[PDB]
Amino acid sequence: MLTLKIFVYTVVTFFVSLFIFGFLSNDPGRNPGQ
């Protein structure tokens, strides 16, 4: 059961870190406006 908890924690933190550091990567500049 501890292995499942470790695996789920790893997956969740991976996806949340992806979300955070993707929205930190100059997101407002990705628009078609001139």
Ligand X SMILES: CCCCCCCCCCCCCCCCCC(=O)OC[C@H](CO[C@@H]1O[C@H](CO)[C@H](O)[C@H](O)[C@H]1O)OC(=O)CCCCCCCCCCCCCCCCC
Please report, as ranges, the residues that interact with ligand X according to CB under 6 A: 12, 16, 19-20
Q: How far is the CB of 23 from another protein (least distance, A)?
A: 11
The tokens of 31 are what?
């628009």
CB of 14 to ligand X, least distance (A): 11
How far is it between the farthest Cα atoms of the chain? Answer: 53
- Sequence-ordered list of residues with C-beta below 8 angstroms from that of 18, at least 6 positions apart, any chain: none
Q: Which residue is nearest to ligand X (CB)?
A: 16
Binding partner of 2, given ligand X, another protein, none, CB within 5-8 angstroms per partner class: another protein
